[PDB]
Predict the structure.
Amino acid sequence: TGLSEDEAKEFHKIFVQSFIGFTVVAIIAHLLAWSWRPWIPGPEGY
Amino acid sequence: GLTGLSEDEAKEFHKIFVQSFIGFTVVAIIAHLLAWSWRPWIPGPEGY
Amino acid sequence: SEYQNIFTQVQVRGPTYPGVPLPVGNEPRTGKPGFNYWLGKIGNAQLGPIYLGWLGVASLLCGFVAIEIIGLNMAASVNWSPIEFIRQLPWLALEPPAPEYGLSLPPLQEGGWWLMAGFFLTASIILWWVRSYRRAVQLGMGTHVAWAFASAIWLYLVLGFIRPLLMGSWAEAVPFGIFPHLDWTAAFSIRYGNLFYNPFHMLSIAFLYGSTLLFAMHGATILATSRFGGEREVEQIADRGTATERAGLFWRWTMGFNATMESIHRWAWWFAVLTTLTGGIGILLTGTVVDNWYLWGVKHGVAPAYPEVYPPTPDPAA
Amino acid sequence: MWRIWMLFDPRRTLIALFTFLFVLAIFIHFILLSTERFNWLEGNAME
Amino acid sequence: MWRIWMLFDPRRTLIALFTFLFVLAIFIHFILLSTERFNWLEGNAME
Amino acid sequence: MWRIWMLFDPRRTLIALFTFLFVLAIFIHFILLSTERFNWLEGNAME
Amino acid sequence: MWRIWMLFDPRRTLIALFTFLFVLAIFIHFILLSTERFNWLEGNAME
Amino acid sequence: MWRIWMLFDPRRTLIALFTFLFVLAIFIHFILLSTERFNWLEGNAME
Amino acid sequence: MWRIWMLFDPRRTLIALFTFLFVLAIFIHFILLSTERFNWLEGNAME
Amino acid sequence: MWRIWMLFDPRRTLIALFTFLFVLAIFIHFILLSTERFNWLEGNAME
Amino acid sequence: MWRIWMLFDPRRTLIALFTFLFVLAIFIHFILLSTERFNWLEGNAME
Amino acid sequence: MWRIWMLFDPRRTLIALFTFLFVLAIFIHFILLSTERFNWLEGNAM
Amino acid sequence: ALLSYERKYRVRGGTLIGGDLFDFWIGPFYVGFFGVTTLFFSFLGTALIIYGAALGPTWNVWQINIAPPDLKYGLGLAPLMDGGLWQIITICAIGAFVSWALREVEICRKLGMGLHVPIAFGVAIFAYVTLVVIRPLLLGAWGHGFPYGIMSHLDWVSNVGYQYLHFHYNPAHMIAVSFFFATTFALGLHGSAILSVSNPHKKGDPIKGTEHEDTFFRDFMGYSIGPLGIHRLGLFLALSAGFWSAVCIVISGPFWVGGWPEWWDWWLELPIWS
Amino acid sequence: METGALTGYMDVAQVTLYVFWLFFAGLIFYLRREDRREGYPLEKDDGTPEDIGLVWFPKPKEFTLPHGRGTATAGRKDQRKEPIEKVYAWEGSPFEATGNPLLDGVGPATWAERDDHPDLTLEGVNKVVPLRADPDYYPCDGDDDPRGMTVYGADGKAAGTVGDLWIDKADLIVRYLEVELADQPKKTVMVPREFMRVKGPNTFFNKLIGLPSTQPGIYVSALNAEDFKNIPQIKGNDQITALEEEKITAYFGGGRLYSTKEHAGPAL
Ligand code: BCL
Ligand code: BCL
Ligand SMILES: CC[C@H]1c2cc3[nH]c4c(c3C)C(=O)[C@H](C(=O)OC)c4c3nc(cc4[nH]c(cc(n2)[C@@H]1C)c(C(C)=O)c4C)[C@@H](C)[C@@H]3CCC(=O)OC/C=C(\C)CCC[C@H](C)CCC[C@H](C)CCCC(C)C
Ligand SMILES: CC[C@H]1c2cc3[nH]c4c(c3C)C(=O)[C@H](C(=O)OC)c4c3nc(cc4[nH]c(cc(n2)[C@@H]1C)c(C(C)=O)c4C)[C@@H](C)[C@@H]3CCC(=O)OC/C=C(\C)CCC[C@H](C)CCC[C@H](C)CCCC(C)C
Ligand SMILES: CC(C)=CCC/C(C)=C\CC/C(C)=C/CC/C(C)=C/CC/C(C)=C\CC/C(C)=C/CC/C(C)=C/CC/C(C)=C/CC/C(C)=C/CC/C(C)=C/CC1=C(C)C(=O)c2ccccc2C1=O
Ligand SMILES: COC(C)(C)C/C=C/C(C)=C/C=C/C(C)=C/C=C/C(C)=C/C=C\C=C(C)\C=C\C=C(C)\C=C\C=C(C)\C=C\CC(C)(C)OC
Ligand SMILES: CCCCCCCCCCCCO[C@@H]1O[C@H](CO)[C@@H](O[C@H]2O[C@H](CO)[C@@H](O)[C@H](O)[C@H]2O)[C@H](O)[C@H]1O
Ligand SMILES: [Ca+2]
Ligand SMILES: [Fe+3]
Ligand SMILES: [Mg+2]
């Protein structure tokens, strides 16, 4: 990999933040999509 | 000097290139005016 | 007129090559190698020796049983007439079991022989496959032949075993005959609505066309650069020569990109295996998960719609 | 967990991850477009 | 069980494991989609 | 924005730009010719 | 604008341009021949 | 007889034997499933 | 315009032109033959 | 104009010219053979 | 005629002759079996 | 005409000539068998 | 723009037409005179195909169909929207394919290579002109050519095949298919063979030479054709596949009109077993 | 749900097709990476390297050679100074030889820097040897023996006589013809098999029918008789080095453009 431990931690810090930011935007998108049309049918089937 | 032309050679080619492009375009413009006088190609609301 | 390297003009003769020494645990090679002049015109003149281990003899015996079952049944179908056997040979077949038996074991009268021939032929092919694996490993070479062979077996297995298993009927399988298995091939496409519209059949044909295209390119490319030693490909891979450079540059200047001497055989390997890999998947899909490929094409916007030269014909059966 | 980057190169992993994420997102969008309820372009009614 | 990594390279094991886990997950999601009961996009009624 | 030419070769960018723009332009003309309303050579009536 | 010839070689440029201009010219002549109104050889009536 | 193993290598014999036994076991299990009486998954009645 | 021979070598600019001119000439004769009015061999009434 | 034969190979120029002349001559004969008026073998009536 | 063995190899010419003679004999027996009159195994009536 | 064997190998000519003679002889016999008049095995009326 | 070994080979000469004027490169592509004509015919043919697609009912890639003219037009040029466009594209395709082959000849000459590749491509061109020129010419109408569409020409293949009630029984088709199957089988074997010696079973093992290549196939199938033979045989099988494909379709219609299984009655009616 | 259906419109066959499209795209990407193991990184016409990134250019492939020859690395950069000059200044222009391209190794005469050691059989002995160094090998009966025949140049002029045959031990085939030059300054010259045509009475259509050859000999259309003297000479005896093989075969490859000039200049 040719990476020291210091750069490995520093990349992982940004990677986790970017993943959280990407997930947070997606979570909001899924909340908006659910408010539009929920995708869990239920006993009656939509 | 990417193409190997000096500044003067680029001047000379461009002048002839522009002149012949203008001559080529002028003939085409006359051809299009004759074509328009024959049958215009813009339909109109009823589309001729 | 220059030499086109089509036929070897001057062959040389010497001691026959007995093969590289096999490691301990291998049978001695059988046969006394000899030289064939006409084979040496195109390639190597030496014929043999062959390796006949346990896998070789077991595969030969299993294949012999399958061929005998097929041949004796076709001979019996013409009342054991050798004259009618030769005359009708392309038309004769060992018929697959009747549809009434499903996946159950059928009697000899109604396709029991087909199941035995299919079983012993499959065992022969499988034993031949591991022999292909073993012969490569014992020489220290990679097992690329065995896995390319596995792709061919994959289509063979789905055609006669896996798809009939999924359809629950041995009658869905291929007869052991020359013309009848062409009839089965035609009937298969007809039954499932123009297998031309099977996208994996399209892929298999693209790779079959590509494989023939690639060998036309590669065979001609190597022959055109064999004057620089292009036929010694493995030597070119380890130590690149002008033959590899000219071969790559010809294709780079022609179509804008090229391969290496090693990577062209990776293209060759993958195009060949993908022919049977895609084909096996396509055959496995039809009847199990798609039953009318043309209607699948119209469903997915694949089938073109043609202008009506005649009015649409109503079906007279209501 | 930072030690994961001592195994895989972060830059090539990012390329593969971003390619994977876009392809997955495209296919999930297309899967929804293939349904009647979740096709926002065809706009079928619910229930 | 730490000894298992003395025979298997962590990099190739993780790549194979992640590829296997994702393919299995996609395979199981698609299998559910082919069922009437568990197709959450088509939303068939229970029972 | 003069800094983009520190990154991109002006000659290769111009070649890529010109061919891309013509291909886009000719395909937009093609798309217009495929419509009833905007095919100027067919001259279909409006509405 | 003469500086375009410090980036584009006149020889290759003119060969590409004249080839392109010819292809486009006979392509447009072909398009008109394919139409009812502008097929000057078939001579369909106007309107 | 212990002398059986002077002839045949123990390692090759075991590899072939294990494959042969499993293939035979699969062969017999499939044959039983092909029958009405011995298909334990279908569970047909007797007689 | 005599300077074009500095750019384009005339020894083979002619062969690239003669085979161009004949193919264009052979083709225009073809288009005329395909027409009802200008096919001088079939010779339809001019109207 | 005799100088051009220093720049053109007299042998393969003559070969190509004869091949072109014969192909054109054959082609024109065939086009006449396909016409109702100039088919001298079918021999249809004039007018 | 004894001189033909100066040119023809006696061993190779005998093998070819015997192969030719047997093949010819088989086909003549074949042709007779194909006919109605000379099929001595089917034994069709004369006239 | 004895000089024709100066040009052609007598052995190879004889093999080719005998092969040609037999092939033609077989070919003509088969053609007669195909005709209704000259098929001596079926034996049609004249 | 250049491979690390490319610079020495980028020399002048080897052209058939144009000589010095077109002897240059654009990126990796060599142009030559026939490259210009290839571009001319390719752009013209592609533009006319896209124009026919635009004027067609749909933009669906699978459903775009540039059909040939009706059979009633015979060998003449039909109106552009009634199959004439297909006729022009066919000429452009032939011009592009021949120019591509002649361009490959110039590149072959420039590198000192043999002309095997353009000749092998000529077999492919021969199959196309058999489908699009020779067979329509022998049948007397350009409408017998296959349409230019991804799915429409597959429908053409199906309908031509069933014009003889069983195209599998076509004797030349039987030969051509076997060659197509043989070259793919040979290609898989040849690609596997070269990869096996250059990629040994144990990683970081000595590379294997031609002796191992010969020994494996002698061990496996009892015969090894050698590195030179496999490329000769592989090219032969591929070209035989292309050649017999042209034969199989050119005899269907021009030289055989009934069901292809009928044709085998010559074998069944041989006087040896009639 | 229908048996093949997934989402009303989606079905199993469709998603199976898209699974293959993903695999095929990955395979094409993988195959293109293997294509870049040689000839990369790209360089400009003046030698300046081009930028390749990392997802396309793979790590160097190391082949361990047999016979204790060490390890070989794919993508070897040749170190000989190129005796060429760009004809024009713009990129994509041809290169002109600043000397004699036939002897300088330029264009069709270009030779790569192959190994300076002879190719060896698996046993460990030289693969390519003259017939004088191994009487166990001989020309096959039924094929004309080149030894003794005179070698003619492309112009039809005699260039020498065959003195020996160099054969490959692994593949029983003639690899080179040792030609004793008719013109002498005993200078011998190597003619590769693929660059020569044998015209004896045992080739074909001559053994089958029995016709003698009118003018039997070895015919080389690649080079004129005068250019035979400049064919690169092998350093040693009874042993030919792979680099020497490359130079001899490259010299013949450039003959059609530089020696006979039949490929030099347009046809028409
Ligand atoms: C009317 C007929 C249908 C049609 C019906 C089918 C059917 C059915 C199938 C194909 C299949 C294929 N079709 Mg199709 N096909 C049609 C039209 C075409 C056209 C064309 C231009 O018209 C072409 C080029 C093709 C080409 C193809 C191939 C791409 C593919 C076969 C791959 C292969 O090589 O496996 C050939 C090799 C094998 C099958 C076996 C591989 C090796 C085995 C192990 C051999 C063992 C040898 C054995 C030991 C020897 C001893 C045996 C004993 C003597 C008995 N088809 C039309 C639409 N086609 C096959 C496929 O997979 O497509 C999806 C298939 O099943
Ligand atoms: C129901 C249909 C019938 C049938 C009816 C037909 C008909 C009709 C035909 C065939 C033809 C073929 N059939 Mg069939 N065939 C059937 C079943 C089969 C089966 C099978 C498994 O059952 C197989 C394996 C085959 C196999 C074959 C091949 C022998 C042949 C197709 C290859 C070919 O012609 O190459 C030759 C083709 C080429 C070389 C293409 C030419 C390429 C050109 C020169 C280059 C183009 C470049 C391109 C424009 C580049 C684009 C630019 C890009 C951006 C790069 N058929 C069934 C029974 N078959 C065809 C044939 O043999 O005709 C020649 C044919 O016409
Ligand atoms: C990538 C896909 C392509 C492909 C690849 C492929 N095929 C392969 C391989 C590969 C990579 C092999 O390695 C394998 C092989 O062995 O190749 C040389 C093989 C092979 N592909 C074959 C055929 C084949 N491949 C086909 C297709 C394809 N193969 C695809 C196009 C087809 C088609 C199109 O239908 C066929 C028919 C075989 C030649 C071979 C596998 C042979 C095999 O498994 O044989 C097992 C053993 C037997 C059946 C022995 C039976 C014959 C004996 C002579 C019996 C008799 C014994 C005794 C002599 C009796 C004596 C009696 C007398 C005393 C009377
Ligand atoms: C004869 C043996 C096999 C073979 C050989 C072969 N093909 C070859 C070669 C060889 C030796 C080349 O050197 C040449 C090449 O450059 O390969 C990369 C080529 C080639 N074979 C190709 C394709 C190809 N080969 C095929 C088949 C085969 N090629 C045979 C099986 C097929 C099939 C069966 O479908 C195809 C599609 C190309 C990739 C290439 C030739 C490229 C070329 O001609 O370039 C110039 C033209 C263009 C870039 C575009 C022209 C476009 C036209 C003006 C308009 C379209 C016309 C066309 C009729 C449309 C049809 C559409 C419908 C069918 C959907
Ligand atoms: C005239 C002018 C200049 C402008 C006009 C401008 C204009 C008109 C309009 C204005 C708009 C406009 C277009 C502008 C100008 C823009 C323009 C186009 C510029 C000029 C460009 C030019 C000069 C010419 C035209 C370029 C052109 C047509 C390109 C298409 C190329 C093509 C057909 C691709 C097919 C790809 C496929 C799928 C192939 C199947 C085989 C396969 C799967 C192969 C992989 C394995 C492999 C790599 C194998 C090889 C190999 C083998 C076989 C070995 O065996 C081997 C052995 C050992 C080592 C290596 C190898 C080895 O590599
Ligand atoms: C002395 O010898 C004489 C008789 C001459 C012998 C000569 C015999 C001759 C001339 C034989 C000719 C044979 C021919 C022409 C054969 C043609 C075969 C063809 C064309 C086959 C084509 C396709 C066939 C396929 C794809 C068949 C596939 C069958 C499969 C995969 C069967 C699998 C069956 C299995 C695995 C069975 C398992 C047993 C089970 C599990 C069911 O047990 C319960
Ligand atoms: C030294 C002190 C500073 C160190 C830390 C620096 C910042 C570290 C990362 C902070 C969080 C960034 O998080 C990143 O932001 C981008 C901004 O477009 C967002 O990305 C968002 O927009 C992009 C378009 O650009 C979309 O493709 C993506 O789908 C969406 O999520 C995400 O939220 C996340 O990918
Ligand atoms: Ca008949
Ligand atoms: Fe190869
Ligand atoms: Mg049947």
Summary: Residues 189 and 195 of chain M are 10 Å apart (CA to CA). The longest strand of chain M covers residues 25-26. Chain M has eight helices and two strands.
